[PDB]
Design a protein around this nucleic acid. Structure first.
Ligand code: DCP
Ligand code: DCP
Ligand code: NA
Ligand code: NA
Ligand code: NA
Ligand code: NA
Ligand code: NA
Ligand code: NA
Ligand code: NA
Ligand code: NA
Lengths: 375, 375
DNA sequence: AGGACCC
DNA sequence: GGGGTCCT
DNA sequence: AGGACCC
DNA sequence: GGGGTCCT
C-alpha cells in the first residue's frame, strides 16, 4: 500500500578492490591507493592498523611504514568496473540510482511484490531473512511489512552473490523502506555483510548517529551552520523550531533536513542511466605560464575526447575550471560550435578553452575541463 | 540535400484582432489595447494615424483623441487563441516553435519534399508562387531550390487560409531557408500578405536593415555595446574583426551574431509543445505594506492555480519576483512540497511565498509569481 | 539567482 | 506593459 | 556562474 | 584527492 523496499549497495574499499583484482600479489598485503599526497582509500587488510580514508601519505605511512601504495589518479579502470556494477544491478530491476562510483540504490518494490504474488500459502510461513536484522529485532511473519523487507534482503543477497560470481567483487547492502534508511543500515555490518531494517527500529538507527553531519543530506557547511545555533544531536534537530531552522537555510533546506532527522525520506530512486557530464582534472603546487597550462589543457582534452566519443552521444557544452593560491573555484563555459561537434577537433577545441582561460586569468593551483549538455 | 524550408507565421496586431473578433462594433473603429499607461498595440485601422506600439496613452491619445481603447492586462483570451493557432499549424507539420503569443516557425522541409515526391514531370513546370517574392526576383523553374521555396509558399498560403477559415484570423508568412531569414521576409509586406525569399536575394534582405538591433538575436544592451565600438550597420558587423567581437561579449555571442549578420542561421525549429512555466504579474505606483502585498500575492495565486490545474501536468517549483523604486528585478525560488502538489492548497502556498517575500524585503513597484519545473 | 534574448 | 524562452 | 550536496 | 549530481 505504497510502502517501498529499497536496497542500497555499497562496495568495500572500491578502488583498492580493483587494484587487488588486477594484481593478486596485493591480496592481503595491506594496500592503500594513492592520489597526490593522499591515501584516498585502503584495504581492510590495512584499516585495522588505524589507517583511514583521506589520510596523509606521511601519516598513513609512519603508521605502517611498510604499507604498500598504488597510484589511483587515473580513474579509468574504476569508472569501468563501476558501470559494470550498475549494469549488473540493472538486470534485476531497471531503476538504479548511482551515488558515486561505488554506491547504488535499487527500488525493489515491484520485484518483492511479484515474488510474493508468487508464493503458496505454506511457503509463506518459511520466508527467512538473509543476513543481519538491524538491532537484533524480532521478525513477525504476520507483518506484511516484515515479510517484504525479508524478501528485499533475499534479493540483496542475490545481487551480492552475483557481484561476486560475475565480477569478483564483495560489498554491502542495506534494505529498508527509503533511500536515507537503506543508506544508513548498509553500514551497520562491514565489510562483506548485509543488514535489513524493520520499521520498529527506525528511531534506534537514527538516534545511533552521533553528529548530524552523518545524515546523508547534511554537509560540512550545513552542520557547522547548525552547530552555531546549538543543534548537535539528531534529536536537537528533531525537536527544533521550524521557524529557527528557516532563519538559517531557507524553507527548502529547513523542511527537508528536519524530515531526514526523523528518518523520513520521500525521494524516489531515479534512473541514472548514462552520465550527464565527463570531466578530467589536474591539481598542483603552483602553475602560471600560459603556455604549458595550454599543455595541461591539451592533456585533459586528448583524454576527454576519447571518453566522450565511445559513449555515442555528443556534448554541446565545454567548461573550463581553475583555482588560485591562496575553495573557491572559478569557471567559464560556452557551447560547442555545430561543425565542431562533428568528430580536426582538438585544434579548434583548444582555441576555445584558451580564450575561456584568458577571461579570468590576467596578468593557479588546479585546472580541469568539463563536457556537458549531452545530446 | 540538407537545405531547409521554414515558414514564419506572424499574426497582425494580435491582441487588437482578438478584441475585434469578440466585439464587432470595434471593426474599423481605430482600436488600441491598453495595459496600464501604454497602448501595447493597435489596429491598422489606427496605425496610419501615426499611432505606434508601446505608445503613451496621452500620446496615443492626443493624436487621435477619439481613438478607442480596450483593457488588455488580462492575457487569458490571447493565450487561448494563441495556442489554437499553434495547434492549427501543428496539424500541418508537428514541429512548431512559438515565439511569443503571435509568432510561429514551422519546418516545412519534410512536407515540401513529400509533395514534390508526388508530382508528374509535367505538373512540375506549372509550379507557381503564392504571394510576394522578395525583391521582385525572377524565378527559375529549374533551380531545385526555387521550386521548393514556391511549394513552401503554397503551404504558407494554406496555413493562412486555414487560420482565417478556422479562426477568423489574418496575418503574414515568410518562407525562406532558415529561421532568421524567414522571420525577416515575413514583414516585407504587411498586413495580410506573404513573401518568399529566393537564395539570391539574401544579401539584399540583410543589408536592407538600418540598425543591427533589427537582427533577431541582437538586443538593446548588445546593440549599444557594439555601437560603443563603432559598429552600426549590418556590414560593419559583417566585416568586423572576430577578435574584437570576442573582447566584448564572449566567443558564444561573438561567433553567433556574426553569422546572423551574414544571414546564416543553423538553429533548428524546436517543438515548443506545452509551456515550461505559467506566471502572473502585477505592476504599480508604489506598494509597501506587508499585508495587502500578501493580497496582491493572493490574487496571482488564485488565478495561477486555475491555469496550472487544467494543463494536467504539475509544477514542482514556485517563484516570487519583485522590483524597487528607484530593472533590476529580484527573485526567490523553492520546490513545492510533495503533499502540496496533490491538489487546501492556497493556504499552505501563501505561507511559502510570504517567507520568500521576507528574505528580500525588510524594513516595491512590482510583484509576480511563477510556477515552473513542470512534470 | 540573475542575466540575455524574444513577442 | 504582461508575459515567454534558454544560458550562466 | 556559482553554490550545495554526494562518493 | 578526482570525480559526480541537482538547484539558484
Ligand atoms: N572524497 C572521496 C570519497 C570517496 N572516494 C573514492 C575512494 C573509494 O575507493 C571510493 C568509493 O566510496 P566509499 O566512500 O564507499 O569509500 P570506499 O569504498 O573506499 O570504502 P568503504 O566501503 O570501506 O567504506 O571512491 C574518493 O576518491 N574521494
Ligand atoms: N513588448 C511587447 C511586444 C508585444 N506584445 C504583444 C502585443 C501584440 O499584440 C502581440 C504580438 O506581437 P507582435 O510584435 O507581432 O505585435 P503585433 O502582433 O501587435 O503587431 P504587428 O503585426 O502589427 O506588427 O503581443 C507586448 O505585449 N509587449
Ligand atoms: Na539476474
Ligand atoms: Na552527511
Ligand atoms: Na543523499
Ligand atoms: Na490540415
Ligand atoms: Na533584434
Ligand atoms: Na530569435
Ligand atoms: Na533547448
Ligand atoms: Na531530477
Amino acid at each position: 500500500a505504497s510502502s517501498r523496499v529499497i536496497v542500497h549497495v555499497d562496495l568495500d574499499c572500491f578502488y583498492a578492490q580493483v587494484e587487488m583484482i588486477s594484481n593478486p600479489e596485493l591480496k592481503d598485503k595491506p594496500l592503500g591507493v594513492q592520489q597526490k599526497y593522499l591515501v584516498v582509500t585502503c584495504n581492510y587488510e590495512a584499516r585495522k592498523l588505524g589507517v583511514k580514508k583521506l589520510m596523509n601519505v606521511r601519516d598513513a605511512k609512519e603508521k605502517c611504514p611498510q604499507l604498500v601504495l598504488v597510484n589511483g589518479e587515473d580513474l579509468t579502470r574504476y569508472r569501468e568496473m563501476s558501470y559494470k556494477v550498475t549494469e549488473l544491478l540493472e538486470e534485476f530491476s531497471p531503476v538504479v540510482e548511482r551515488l558515486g562510483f561505488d554506491e547504488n540504490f535499487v527500488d525493489l518494490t515491484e520485484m518483492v511484490e511479484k515474488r510474493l504474488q508468487q508464493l503458496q500459502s505454506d511457503e509463506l510461513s518459511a520466508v527467512t531473512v538473509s543476513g543481519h536484522v538491524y538491532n537484533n529485532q524480532s521478525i513477525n511473519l504476520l507483518d506484511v511489512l516484515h515479510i517484504r523487507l525479508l524478501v528485499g534482503s533475499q534479493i540483496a543477497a542475490e545481487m551480492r552473490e552475483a557481484m561476486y560470481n560475475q565480477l569478483g567483487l564483495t560489498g554491502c547492502a542495506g534494505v529498508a523502506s527509503n533511500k536515507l534508511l537503506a543508506k544508513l543500515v548498509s553500514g551497520v555490518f562491514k565489510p562483506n555483510q548485509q543488514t535489513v531494517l524493520l520499521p520498529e527500529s527506525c528511531q534506534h538507527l537514527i538516534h545511533s548517529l552521533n553528529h548530524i553531519k552523518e545524515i546523508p543530506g547534511i554537509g560540512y557547511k550545513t552542520a557547522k551552520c547548525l552547530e552555531a545555533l546549538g543543534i548537535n544531536s539528531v534529536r536537537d534537530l528533531q525537536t527544533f523550531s521550524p521557524k529557527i531552522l528557516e532563519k538559517e537555510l531557507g524553507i527548502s533546506v529547513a523542511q527537508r533536513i528536519q524530515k531526514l532527522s526523523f528518518g523520513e525520506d520521500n525521494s524516489p530512486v531515479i534512473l541514472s542511466g548514462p552520465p550527464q557530464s565527463f570531466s578530467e582534472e589536474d591539481s598542483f603546487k603552483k602553475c602560471s605560464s600560459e603556455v604549458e597550462a595550454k599543455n595541461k589543457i591539451e592533456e585533459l582534452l586528448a583524454s576527454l575526447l576519447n571518453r566522450v566519443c565511445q559513449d555515442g552521444r555528443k556534448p554541446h557544452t565545454v567548461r573550463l575550471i581553475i583555482r588560485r593560491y591562496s575553495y573557491g573555484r572559478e569557471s567559464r563555459q560556452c557551447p560547442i560550435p555545430s561543425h565542431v561537434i562533428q568528430k580536426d577537433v582538438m585544434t579548434p577545441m583548444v582555441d576555445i578553452l584558451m580564450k575561456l582561460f584568458r577571461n579570468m586569468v590576467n596578468v593557479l593551483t588546479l585546472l580541469s575541463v568539463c563536457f556537458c549538455n549531452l545530446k
